[PDB]
Amino acid sequence: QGMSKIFGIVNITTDSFSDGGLYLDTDKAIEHALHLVEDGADVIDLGAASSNPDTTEVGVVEEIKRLKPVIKALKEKGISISVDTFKPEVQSFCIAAAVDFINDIQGFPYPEIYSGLAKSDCKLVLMHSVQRIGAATKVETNPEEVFTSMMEFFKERIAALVEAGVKRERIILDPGMGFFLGSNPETSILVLKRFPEIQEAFNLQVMIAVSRKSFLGKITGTDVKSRLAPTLAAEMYAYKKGADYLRTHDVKSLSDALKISKALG
């Protein structure tokens, strides 16, 4: 039967800095990516910057300098690559490298780039985000408001992309999780138990990305270093309900959870 596809999270910056040698070493993140494929990652999700860009350097030229050797090495081994980036100039390079996915926390709001996205066979994952880059953190207090607004934001953005020429069945909808729904945990749970409505309402694939998000920690009172168990609980829940894609760090713990669950059924 069906089975959620696993996006293996590989952040070049943290993987290159874990030694403490203050080295921008893509080699450490290439090997980490290869490990995730061995653990059973269907797609590798690349990240050359952080998603909350409070950080001092958001450079477009360096964000490409980091994805450059990793995409080269992974593409030669046949690895399905997904790059997570909000900068249109960085996504333009992703189109030029013919990566398999492009992950936009901003959901492609720059129509300058639409015509090129259409021509390329890149699958787009279209994330809804309640927050704005650079602005203060929003605590969206009304979960049902965030859910209906999320549905409106999709209905408009999908039609905008499809008018520009993007084939619609190459769009994946990520409703966002945790930070992207407001620091309110309950709205995170709401989206989790309501994402099948998104599939039915649009006949599109849906990606659920709950791994290690702080809302899990608030339900269990657990620290970030010990979120594996509440993570696996959530990823399993999304799987049984029909998630098309699951984004996670511990690909292998997730593979074990899915392998055990499919065998029991």
Add this chain to the structure above:
Amino acid sequence: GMSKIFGIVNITTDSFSDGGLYLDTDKAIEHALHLVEDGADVIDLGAASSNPDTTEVGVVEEIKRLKPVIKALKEKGISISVDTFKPEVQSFCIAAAVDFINDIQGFPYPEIYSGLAKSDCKLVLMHSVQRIGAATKVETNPEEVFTSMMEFFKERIAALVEAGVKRERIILDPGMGFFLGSNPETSILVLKRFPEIQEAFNLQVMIAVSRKSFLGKITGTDVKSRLAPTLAAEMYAYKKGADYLRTHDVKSLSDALKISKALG
């Protein structure tokens, strides 16, 4: 619809004569307290010997190590289950009034059945494919292993309720992993059809799946020290209605059920 966790606490001591028995039972208590804070409804006490074989001297030492931990725990008001198969040790448990007696041999000695009746301890009646006092041959094929233990419960329950034990005290553990043969399907079969135990006997079922090797057959990873493949199976049993879950990693369990309840 909530499953109760059994926390596994092992009391270990070397082969030299005491002096410092306290700083081994004291950690077992510290371990059991930490397990309660991690969400353990019942502590499952284990006091197996160095050479796990019955002897008249090994019993008095197994009791010697169970005594201070049992006493310290139900001083704190914690529910106690004792994992032991030696009748003299079980008898001390009956007098200790522990909340559960977990016998891997399935109470195969009708000489003790009288004393089990004169108590309120719950009896975790456990099944095993290689059980004591059976004239039946061991079974190879899973669906036969299933119907075999289904009849084992039927008869072993009748022997207990006759002797004077109330059937409401008998929790059924069908056993898992090596206890059903080196055949992974057996434990898979039982893992999904164990609701058939509950309805056909009108009784609670314990599922003890944590860190069993058959999970490694399904997965291809190191289940003996890894969290996920165990937790994946424990969650399955929870949704299928398991009344009790025996587990080492209580914290991982407890939090995985907190998530599954918020998503209820």
